[PDB]
Structure 1
Amino acid sequence: DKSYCGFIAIVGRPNVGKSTLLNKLLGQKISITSRKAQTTRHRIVGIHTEGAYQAIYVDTPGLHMEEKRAINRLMNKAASSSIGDVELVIFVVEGTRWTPDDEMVLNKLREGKAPVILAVNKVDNVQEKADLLPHLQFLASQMNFLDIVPISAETGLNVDTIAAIVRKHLPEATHHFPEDYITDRSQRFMASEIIREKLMRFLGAELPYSVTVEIERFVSNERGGYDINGLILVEREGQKKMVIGNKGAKIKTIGIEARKDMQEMFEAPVHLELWVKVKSGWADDERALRSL
């Protein structure tokens, strides 16, 4: 009978695992991690809808009036239509690291009426726990966190835990967005989206969890046309062989079919270059082929 919907923040200095945490929270089988300097004007970074709950994830602790009108334009709603406020904040930090950049973010939060969760990422990396406890005690000394939760974004350590608090903070309200609305309407996202389907379609029963599509390059040329470079990141090594398939079949197909739509959708032929890769890093041979 009742539904809940609200905005939630995910802040932290760059390269802390924010994007990885977001994808785990969005709960999509095949995710789409973009690398944009092109900061949205609405700051929406993803929307998780499930049952009566709709959490709208933003990358700002507080939503400006400017950001409120932009969210409305995104929804094609009157600029005057009411938009709430951030109800929770997930402050992500990296293990035992603490730069003036981490403080910069922390400084912007404390000065708010929104509760904040400290998400300590890559906590397993710190092989010297003798660094951890002292650190965590120093962190908690920075402000009153609603909670301090250590996570592994690539394992989903305490993502369910953060998922639960997040929902507890969704105010009673009607959803602002239709279920599968797109906040990224760029061609670059359209591209990632076509690859995503081809993987889902062609991998079939062999699709593993945690796959991530991403456009490393989308451009035109001095000779004209659309140069698109797809990056299909996977968790394991053997998984990488799946996406590639027998003789290179599966990755061949996914690429022709994906290129097809990229052309049917966009209005220009595209030279699509699809690269499978394990998130832990390229391999020797791969690093070689990546230079050819």
Structure 2
Amino acid sequence: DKSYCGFIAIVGRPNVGKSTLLNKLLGQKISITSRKAQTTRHRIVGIHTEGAYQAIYVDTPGLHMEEKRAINRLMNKAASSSIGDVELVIFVVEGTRWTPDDEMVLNKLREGKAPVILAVNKVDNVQEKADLLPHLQFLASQMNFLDIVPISAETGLNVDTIAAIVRKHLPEATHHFPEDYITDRSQRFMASEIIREKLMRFLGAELPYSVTVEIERFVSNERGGYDINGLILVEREGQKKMVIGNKGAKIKTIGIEARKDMQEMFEAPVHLELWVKVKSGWADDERALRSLG
């Protein structure tokens, strides 16, 4: 009748789909990505809190004192307040690709005490579904995995399977964090949050699943103001038009409101541009439209 809270690492070389899977695990209808991907002192990438379960996702396999201290700062807690250890490692790879980078990551998991799960991502993207079996057996001989589960972070295929395992490894404990805590204080992130919020405000009942927001460009001008490029991404074409809305008024208003809330929070000028793109490729009219004024 009490609670569970713990640290779950998500690891794997760049591009295997770590952030994509993280987002499917957080389960927000609108998600945020960042093609900049930078390293923080506390290594928290996201927090999933549902009922009595709080999963704290990090991007290092093990937490070292410097980092527990950074995590305590983030929460504004006395630096000697206790912090547990990574309880489960999600090792992520893509389809049947296997490189020395993949191995460098593996090397640091045996170095640890925590059980490792092997999430074979981009499974949807495998050419000959045959190649899989032999590869998986080769993968399995690399170390004792608690489990091996092929997934598509994009589709959601098997991600619930990862979730359920994660829940199982949360030690009994009080939650560290408040339910909706901001772990990324960067202005760049704050811009995303505002767009996501305006999307949720104005789309209402029509707003689909799997929308993601992303800030392609964040700069300060000479005028001590700001220039921001926002990119809103949707699964299918029909959705792209609900976002733009009848006569382009929907995306027009969203932009106006977001640029407003943005100027207020940044106490500075803001020029905001917003693009709606369908994940699977731009388009002919759109690409040619992109490179303009």
TM-score bracket, shorter-length normalisation: over 0.9
The DSSP-based 3-state class of the residue aligned with 2:49 is: strand
- For residues 141-183 of structure 1, give each alpha carbon's deviation from its aligned partner in whole angstroms, at most 9, with x where no partner exists: 1111101001111111111110000000000000000000000
Shift of 1:127: 2.0
The reply on whether 1:285 has 2:285 as its aligned counterpart is: yes
Q: Distance in 2 between matches of 1:210 and 1:199?
A: 13
Structure 1 residue 129, shift from structure 2 partner: 2.1
How much has 1:34 moved relative to structure 2?
Answer: 2.2
The whole-number CA distance in structure 1 between the counterparts of 2:280 and 2:70 is 36
| Per-residue deviation, residues 33-76 of structure 1 (Å, max 9, x unmatched) | 12334311000000000111100000110011111100000000
Which segment is superposed worse, 15-24 or 223-232? 223-232
Write the distance in 1 (CA, Å) between the matches of 2:270 and 2:133: 52
Residue 188 of structure 1 corresponds to: 188
The answer to which of 232-241 and 35-44 deviates more is: 35-44
Distance 1:124 1:193 in 2: 30
Distance apart, 1:278 and its partner CA: 1.3
Q: Tell me, what secondary structure is at the counterpart of 1:170?
A: coil
Moved more, 276-285 or 112-121: 276-285
How big is each residue's C-alpha offset from its partner over 1:10-36, in whole Å with a ceiling of 9 and x where there is no partner? 001111111110011011111111233
Mapped to 1, the partners of 2:195 and 2:29 lie a distance apart of: 13
- TM-score, scaled relative to structure 1: 0.98
**Across the two proteins, how many residue pairs are aligned to each other?**
292
Q: Write the distance in 1 (CA, Å) between the matches of 2:91 and 2:282.
A: 30
Structure 1 gaps, min length 5: none
1:223 Cα offset (Å): 4.5
**More deviation in 84-93 or 239-248?**
239-248
Aligned alpha-carbon RMSD (Å): 1.0
Identity %: 100
- In the other structure, the counterpart of 1:207 is 207
Instruction: Name 1:98's counterpart in structure 2.
Output: 98
Task: Determine the structure 1 residue equivalent to 2:113.
Answer: 113
Unaligned segments of structure 2, at least 5 residues: none
Q: Structure 1 residue 241: deviation in Å?
A: 1.2
How many angstroms apart in 2 are the aligned matches of 1:175 and 1:69? Answer: 17
What do the CA deviations read for 1:247-276 (whole angstroms, capped 9, x no partner)? Answer: 211110100011010011111110000111
> Secondary structure of 1:142's partner?
coil
Aligned to 1:217: 217
Once structures 1 and 2 are overlaid, which stretch shifts more, 222-231 or 248-257? Answer: 222-231
TM-score between both structures, scaled by the size of structure 2:
0.97
- Distance (Å, rounded) in 2 between the aligned partners of 1:22 and 1:38: 15
Q: Secondary structure at the match of 1:98?
A: coil
**Displacement after TM superposition at 1:242 (Å):** 1.3
Q: SS of 1:73's equivalent?
A: helix
Aligned 8 A contact 2:224 2:268 in 1: no
Q: Is the 8 A contact 2:41 2:67 kept in 1?
A: yes
- The alignment partner of 2:130 has SS state of helix
Choose 53-62 or 102-111, whichever is displaced more: 102-111
Q: Secondary structure at the match of 1:201?
A: helix
Contact 2:224–2:269 at 8 Å: present in 1 too? no
